[PDB]
RNA sequence: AUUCCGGUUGAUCCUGCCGGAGGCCACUGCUAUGGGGGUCCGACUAAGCCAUGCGAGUCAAGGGGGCGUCCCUUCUGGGACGCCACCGGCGGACGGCUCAGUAACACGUCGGUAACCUACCCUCGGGAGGGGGAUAACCCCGGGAAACUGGGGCUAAUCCCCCAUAGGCCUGGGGUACUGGAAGGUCCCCAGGCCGAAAGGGAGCCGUAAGGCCCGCCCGAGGAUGCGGCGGCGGCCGAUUAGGUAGUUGGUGGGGUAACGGCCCACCAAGCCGAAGAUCGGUACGGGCCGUGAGAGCGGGAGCCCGGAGAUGGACACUGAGACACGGGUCCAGGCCCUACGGGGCGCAGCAGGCGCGAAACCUCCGCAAUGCGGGAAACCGCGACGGGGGGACCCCCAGUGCCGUGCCUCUGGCACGGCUUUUCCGGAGUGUAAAAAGCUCCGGGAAUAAGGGCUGGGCAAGGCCGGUGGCAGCCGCCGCGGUAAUACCGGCGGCCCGAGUGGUGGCCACUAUUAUUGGGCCUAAAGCGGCCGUAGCCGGGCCCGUAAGUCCCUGGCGAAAUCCCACGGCUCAACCGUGGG
RNA sequence: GGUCAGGUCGAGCCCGGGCUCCGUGAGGGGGGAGAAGUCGUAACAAGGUAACCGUAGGGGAACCUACGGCUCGAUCACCUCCU
């Protein structure tokens, strides 16, 4: 899926750690999934070993985009434009927690998670 | 190991419960509950050993389960289960009462109390913290907690002693330790002894925090505050080697 | 183990004692003599040991010590730790099974036990020793009777009459 | 508990190697280990693979039945046990085994996650309202030699779900109150969004049903327990390995995880590391301890306990707080076995036992009884985990193999002969079995009745002769010994040692100041660099002054149990184990 | 569960290079042993040629000569020490 950990790989000198030893399922880490730009939200509820439940996103159409008291709304996203953590993904519409956008009445910037959170926040800018 | 170990070895038992540690190779493993496995005294153990009341470990489930002990008012039926320190312990069948108490030699003893004392269990509560409502609740080593207050600064930080009605799981009769208070120490190197404190003084920053103490002798010992437990202005008696 | 087999084992002046002994004290094997000197070789080695160092190591040891030589007889009165350095290793001879029934006149010499103890006639507290090594203490000299007897069962029996001739006593 | 001897020579002194004498640990020969107690046994082999038995289940008091039987009754009818399949729940990640790899934040100790989760369990608070629904069993039926598999009508539960009651989580703004060493976690209001709690119980007892004792579920908080994570210090050898590095060092944003993190990713920079030994090759589970030694030191990682690692080699996911899973699955590699040849099944470096290997190591035993544990109200079930016996030159300890008279020899003794008691051994009794065994021990009958092996020139002067043979055959650890009156050969006899052992080989430690810190040297014994220079490093006159880092003192946290000493006690005794102290 | 597009985890097989160890091959070099064979007489006295040494060339071999050093050097080796 995506093998960890991880503290195998080199020495900061040059040299070789090797630390024999096949991995744990508590350690390793998952492939990612892509949250996309849709008009609807498309959720599916898994629960993660630990004994915790997360809501999990795969689609998205949120933004619920806060005044400067923080007053909400439910309102529908349109074009990732301008995605900071890599370029590439302002094409393919893919939502970051860095991530900046276009929403229905005005610009606004993702400041959520929308892996585990299930949900994607933000918060109008003047821009 | 990938799981909690469910078996304890005898040579893995070890001396502060006096117990032969050559006896067979399997020893009592309490499942989790208030306390620590190495740091409790095994129902087991109370039954069987202490009193000469089974010889046999059907004989001491079979004796606890049709009833012998009540440790804390409430019921109890297998001898597995992690007696705490400071707890109170009850043969209801023969009037005596005990306190898990430490030895210098750092052994448990089962030290016998009036049947007043039962009453009575003093706890020095473990931390102090919000929960919702706005109502602080008071915890403990063993678990034992009680709930409902109205916030605020009450009674202390968290050294503490409360009066507590075991059948009732109820709290009364709430002290503040001082200056002037009476301490039982029970962790670290200094254990059994009661005294009156001098002054609760101590390094003011990093994680050492001292706290400081005399007695009847008069001798000066210096100890967490952490491992200074307030017995009150004494409720139980001392602890004896 | 309670075997002291010295550096050089097969010298001139070790061999000497070691045969010379064996109607004195009772021999029919070396061993039986290397648990004594080793019960003693101890026994001031760790008396050394604390008389070497300061007072600050812990006089309760020094005081338990000191005590079980009173009571064995070894120091009798004695108090002194400098007092066990000196020991020969002939004053734990003398305290054997076979050298302290002899010495009460109950074993005609310490040779002739060597079938009462074994058939099991010569009681010491409230039990038949077995055992030549067996070390006896003061306490322990004031019941030295006899049980399970068949030659002190009958006196008709000429047992009785090779082991006291007048009353054959004390040690040689 | 601190020891030396032979051997360089014609003799001598020094230097120096070798050999031997001591402890310990394998293995090997003879004999023996009677008897009894405790430890132990593929432990330096192929971390080779297996026939066959076995290590994993359990609740009918959750649950509606099918079958046999019981109480009944001999009906209606309700009460039980066994056996049987399906969902529930819990164990199966543990317990047991091994130590290949790994020289590292593996492990130990102190720190520390306010970055992170934690069900069963335990505590305190509160909740379980209503609606919806199934599939085995039963009934019927097809195939495969098998493994194994089925299609359907009916149907129970703590069955499986939804909604609400809320809670949880995210995010923006205001503010207080709890906890802290601080950072700042926990409180509350508000807006917008999502997810959207829960389940009950038979014959009894308590309550009205729920509920509770009992078993389990839900949410909030805590505890315990397990997992992951970070730091200080300690963490092998070869320099015929000296320069190493491209997620590689950092910054910034982000993903993913239970979660910190170049863990993974995009971008941006060119840093990071090294002679106080980097990197590379090689070897090795680490620790408590253990062996040895007066110590200093050396040597070691084995039973056993602690933590990690593995389970034919490798790769892979799911269910669960917890597995990427030691007697589970998928698949690839190798190999095995069954086969209507279509197609199946596995993993004793788990336990008995087998076979291969080699210098070497066990009964296809007995029991679930006791110990621990899971489930069960309990009764009780499950357990080659476990408790024990069997066998075993595997170690240790204890004990017996006589004693007296006694003529006469070697009188710390021996033998003849006489007398006596008498371990085994027989019959009987307890033990104990938790039903055997281990048979000892005790009582009655009752015998001096299990003792061997090595050495005898010097080292061990501890122990001496004959005959044969004559530098031969042989002996030998070393120095040697035999070329014809041989203490040394071989046989015989005698004596000396030690004793259920003795002796041999291999290894390790002492002896060995032959590793020098204690405690060694360099004119000639082995050893001064052809000489200087000055770098790193090491080392610094007198006087004062600041700091108190080094350095000394005191208190307090702590360095698990076991191993070790001392003391006392128990087992005839002791080894040993308990307990206390150190 | 079907089939397929895109992405990740990802053995097994194959190919080439690097590193490290083991077995082994005509033939060839020296070493430790052997008893007897063969040549010379070098070294040890000054061994009848005092010896060593660094360097260079040559010799069947022990070796020899040249140069410079050295005496751990022969000798009553007598400017001198030694006599």
Redesign the pocket.
């Known amino acids: ?7 195998s ?25 892509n ?1 996309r730009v849709a008009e609807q939200d498309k ?1 599916k ?1 898994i ?9 999990r996103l795969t689609a998205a159409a ?1 933004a ?1 985009v ?9 309102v529908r996203i349109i074009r990732v434009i301008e995605n ?5 993904f302002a094409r393919r519409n893919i939502i ?3 991530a900046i956008i276009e929403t229905e009445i005005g610009k606004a910037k993702v ?9 994607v ?3 109008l800018l003047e821009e | ?15 502060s419960w ?5 006896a ?15 740091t409790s005294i095994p129902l ?1 153990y109370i039954v069987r050993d202490y009193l000469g009341y089974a010889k ?3 004989e001491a ?2 004796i606890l ?1 049709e009833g012998k002990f009540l440790v804390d008012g ?2 109890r ?2 001898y ?3 007696v705490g320190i400071m707890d109170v312990v009850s043969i209801p069948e023969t009037g005596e009462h005990y306190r898990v108490l430490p030895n ?2 750092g ?1 448990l003893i089962l030290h016998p109390i009036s049947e007043d004392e039962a009453f009575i269990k003093p706890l020095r509560i ?9 109502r ?2 008071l ?9 409902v207050s109205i ?4 009674n ?3 050294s503490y002693t409360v009066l507590m009605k075991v059948p009732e ?1 109820e709290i009364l009769e709430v002290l503040p330790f001082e200056k002037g208070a009476y301490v039982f120490v029970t ?4 254990v059994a002894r009661k005294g009156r404190i001098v002054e609760i003084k101590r390094f ?4 050492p ?2 706290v400081t103490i005399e007695d009847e002798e008069g001798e ?5 505050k952490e ?1 200074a437990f307030v017995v009150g202005t004494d409720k139980p008696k001392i602890s004896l ?1 | ?3 002291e ?8 002046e070790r ?1 000497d004692r ?7 004290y009772e ?6 003599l ?2 004594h000197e080793t019960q003693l ?6 008396a ?1 040991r604390l008389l070497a160092a300061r007072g600050k ?2 006089e ?2 020094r005081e ?2 000191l ?2 030589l009173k ?1 064995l007889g070894l120091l009798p009165e004695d108090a002194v730790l400098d007092d066990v ?1 000196s020991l020969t290793i002939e004053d734990i001879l003398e305290r054997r099974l076979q050298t302290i029934v002899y010495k009460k006149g109950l074993a ?2 310490m ?2 036990a ?2 009462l ?4 006639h010569i009681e010491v507290n409230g ?8 070390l006896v203490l003061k306490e322990e000299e004031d019941t030295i009777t006899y049980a ?1 007897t ?2 002190f069962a ?1 006196p008709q ?3 009785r009459m ?1 082991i006291e001739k007048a009353k054959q006593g004390g040690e040689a």
């Open positions: 899926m995506a093998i960890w950990q991880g503290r790989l080199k020495k900061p000198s040059g040299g070789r750690i090797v630390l024999a030893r096949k991995k744990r399922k508590r350690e390793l880490g998952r492939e990612p999934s949250t959720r509820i629960r993660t070993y630990g004994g915790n439940r997360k809501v949120y619920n806060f005044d400067k008291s923080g007053k909400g709304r439910k900071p953590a890599n370029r590439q970051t927690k860095g400041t959520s998670r929308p892996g585990q959170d299930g949900v926040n933000a918060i | 190991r990938k799981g909690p170990k469910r078996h304890l070895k005898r040579l893995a038992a070890p001396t006096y117990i032969e540690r050559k067979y190779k399997w020893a009592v493993r309490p499942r989790p509950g208030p306390h620590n496995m190495r087991l046999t470990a059907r489930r079979k389960n409430r019921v039926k297998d597995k289960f992690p210098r030699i052994k473990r931390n102090k913290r919000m929960i919702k409502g706005a602080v609740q915890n403990f080593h063993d678990g034992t907690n009680h709930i916030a605020e600064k009450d202390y930080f968290t799981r962790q670290g190197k200094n003011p920053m990093g994680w925090d001292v000066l010992f210096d100890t967490l491992y080697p | 183990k309670k075997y087999t010295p550096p050089h084992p097969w010298i001139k061999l070691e045969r010379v002994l064996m109607d004195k021999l029919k094997n070396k061993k039986e290397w648990k070789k101890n026994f001031r080695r760790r050394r190591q812990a309760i040891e338990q010590l005590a079980r009571r350095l005609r010499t040779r002739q060597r079938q103890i074994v058939h099991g039990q038949i020793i077995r055992s030549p090594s067996y399970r068949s030659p009958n029996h000429p047992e090779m």
